[PDB]
Amino acid sequence: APEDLLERLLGEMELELIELRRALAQTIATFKSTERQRDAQQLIAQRWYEKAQAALDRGNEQLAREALGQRQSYQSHTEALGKSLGEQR
Amino acid sequence: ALVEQVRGQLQKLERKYLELKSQKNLYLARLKSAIAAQKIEEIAGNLDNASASSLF
Amino acid sequence: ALVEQVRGQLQKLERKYLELKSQKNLYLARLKSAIAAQKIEEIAGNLDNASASSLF
Amino acid sequence: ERIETKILELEAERELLNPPPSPLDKKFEQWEEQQAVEATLAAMKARRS
Amino acid sequence: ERIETKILELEAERELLNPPPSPLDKKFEQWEEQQAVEATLAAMKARRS
Amino acid sequence: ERIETKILELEAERELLNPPPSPLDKKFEQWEEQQAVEATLAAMKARRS
């Protein structure tokens, strides 16, 4: 009977309005996780920035060269993750 | 040199692993969304309300 | 040297233990709060008062 | 670390269920509130100046 | 000695699969990196000289 | 003697798991520490000279 189907079909819709609901949770969960990782890497680079912020004074430039040269490796990671976070938004 | 060289391989490879792991969830998530939000519109086709092939 | 060296390992390790212990409670506490305050809002969904799928 | 992900999963689970207020109202409540305290005070600072 | 050949066979097996970066980029990353440390330091050595 | 190898195997097993700090930080902690004791003492030797 066509009337009978009208109630079952709408029921099967309800399973996906929650299934799709769960999918969005996973997507947004990754976005939060990806966001957090970015802070840690810049914080480490930030720490090296303070560490390099204590050497170039009183003429110890040679020490500053190595300190900032190490920061460059961390800096690249920050840029890569920064673009990804914006795209995922 | 060998111990220094071999460690570099592990460090580079280890980073590539977690990078792959993160992408796995994202593509899977888009698939379910590309299937869940995908699987509804067809049954609405049976209730099209826009043609003469629907129950409505 | 060995007795001096071995003691340093114990002293460093012992500090790391209680440090781990303190963090355990904090994460567990946030979990229950992230579950208790978490588990209420859904049942309010059954009493949404904002859609046409609630008892209210 | 995985526990933090579970917390993040759960905390953000109902960022969907109860969406945060849009910036438009967030741009107004404070905007009207400043007047609310001052406007209600506008009579205060005048009636009982 | 034949073991070394097997190692060489395996080690060079994926020199094909993952080809090494061409000298052009290898000639630039360091070339830009030297500026990267100095240019970012150029403000460092000037702003907080 | 083989026992020593087992000790060496075990002792160096987690030289991998917990890598030693790189010389760069090892070159700084002491470098900043000398200032830390003297700089904090710099006021000591002056304020209460």
Automatic annotation (TrEMBL), chains B, C:
Positions contributing to ADP 6 binding: 48-49, 51
Positions that bind ADP 5: 46, 49, 51
Family, per entry: Belongs to the PspA/Vipp/IM30 family.
Binding site for ADP 2: 46, 48, 51, 53
Amino-acid positions noted as binding ADP 1 in the UniProt annotation, renumbered to this chain: 21, 48-49
Entry keyword Nucleotide-binding: yes
Coiled coil found in the keyword field: yes
Coiled coil: 1-56
Residues the entry annotates as binding ADP 3: 48-49, 53
Gene that this polypeptide is encoded by: im30
Full protein name: Chloroplast membrane-associated 30 kD protein
Residues annotated to bind ADP 4: 48-49, 51, 53
Key words, A-Z: Coiled coil, Nucleotide-binding
The species this protein was found in: Synechocystis sp. (strain ATCC 27184 / PCC 6803 / Kazusa)
